[PDB]
């Protein structure tokens, strides 16, 4: 009941359908539609869905904190100043 | 120990003179090569491993470099890096680092 060719529509620039399709796939992946379809193919029982959401949230927390630590310590990757000691 | 090594050195000199006399050569000009040749002739040994064959080298070569004591009668070590456990190596590294510091402050067939 919506106007067609407005949603999830990408105009290919200069005929590079490869780039256009990659950009569209990026858009859908960022919006999470690809994961939504993949999971919705088969029914995810509510307990399993809750467990997966909890696991994903814990993984997100851990990965974000690890990335923060990696970036924070990146500056210390410099060459050793006190070589010889 | 010094006493043992000195006794060995004096015994080796005396044995060198005996070997020169036995081979009928001048005791004074008798060299290490002469000692080795005389010993080889007197005690022929076909053992392949040369280290196994009879040898009358100088005690300096025969015995290993058993390290001297590092602390005196008072128990005080001599090298300030003694407690590092590797005083020689760490003193060498300290000297190299000091030389590098001085260089920074002021500024082919060998493996």
From Swiss-Prot, chain A:
What GO biological process term is on the record, naming one?
A: translation
Source organism, top-level taxon? Eukaryota
List the InterPro entries hit by this protein, alphabetically: Ribosomal_bS21, Ribosomal_bS21_sf
For this UniProt entry, the molecular function terms from Gene Ontology, in alphabetical order, are:
RNA binding; structural constituent of ribosome
Species name: Homo sapiens
What's the encoding gene here? MRPS21
Pfam families cross-referenced by the UniProt entry:
Ribosomal_S21
Q: Does the keyword Ribosomal protein apply?
A: yes
Question: Which coarse location class describes where this protein primarily resides?
Answer: mitochondrion
Q: Where in the cell is it found?
A: Mitochondrion
Its quaternary organisation is:
Component of the mitochondrial small ribosomal subunit (mt-SSU). Mature mammalian 55S mitochondrial ribosomes consist of a small (28S) and a large (39S) subunit. The 28S small subunit contains a 12S ribosomal RNA (12S mt-rRNA) and 30 different proteins. The 39S large subunit contains a 16S rRNA (16S mt-rRNA), a copy of mitochondrial valine transfer RNA (mt-tRNA(Val)), which plays an integral structural role, and 52 different proteins.
- Alphabetically list the UniProt keywords: Mitochondrion, Ribonucleoprotein, Ribosomal protein
Family from the record = Belongs to the bacterial ribosomal protein bS21 family.
Q: Name one GO cellular component term.
A: mitochondrial small ribosomal subunit
Q: Which residues form the signal peptide?
A: none
Protein name (record):
Small ribosomal subunit protein bS21m
Swiss-Prot record, chain B:
Entry's localization field: Mitochondrion
Could you describe the subunit structure of this protein?
Component of the mitochondrial small ribosomal subunit (mt-SSU). Mature mammalian 55S mitochondrial ribosomes consist of a small (28S) and a large (39S) subunit. The 28S small subunit contains a 12S ribosomal RNA (12S mt-rRNA) and 30 different proteins. The 39S large subunit contains a 16S rRNA (16S mt-rRNA), a copy of mitochondrial valine transfer RNA (mt-tRNA(Val)), which plays an integral structural role, and 52 different proteins.
Entry's family note = Belongs to the universal ribosomal protein uS9 family.
Please state what the protein is called: Small ribosomal subunit protein uS9m
Name the source organism.
Answer: Homo sapiens
């Amino acid at each position: 009941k919506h106007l067609k060719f407005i949603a999830r529509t990408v105009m290919v620039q200069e005929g590079n359908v490869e780039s256009a399709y990659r950009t569209l796939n990026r858009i859908l992946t960022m919006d999470g539609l690809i994961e939504d379809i993949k999971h919705r193919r088969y029914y995810e029982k509510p307990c399993r869905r809750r467990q997966r959401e909890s696991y994903e949230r814990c993984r997100r927390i851990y990965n974000m904190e690890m990335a923060r630590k990696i970036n924070f310590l990146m500056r210390k990757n410099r060459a050793d100043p006190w070589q010889g000691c | 120990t010094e006493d043992f090594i000195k006794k060995q050195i004096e015994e080796f000199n005396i044995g060198k003179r005996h070997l020169a006399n036995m081979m009928g050569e001048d005791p004074e000009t008798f060299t290490q090569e002469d000692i080795d040749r005389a010993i080889a002739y007197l005690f022929p040994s076909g053992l392949f491993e040369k280290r196994a064959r009879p040898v009358m080298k100088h005690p300096e070569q025969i015995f290993p470099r058993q390290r001297a004591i590092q602390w005196g009668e008072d128990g005080r070590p001599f090298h300030y890096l003694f407690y590092t456990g590797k005083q020689s190596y760490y003193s060498l590294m300290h000297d190299v680092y000091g030389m590098l510091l001085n260089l920074e402050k002021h500024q082919i067939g060998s493996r």
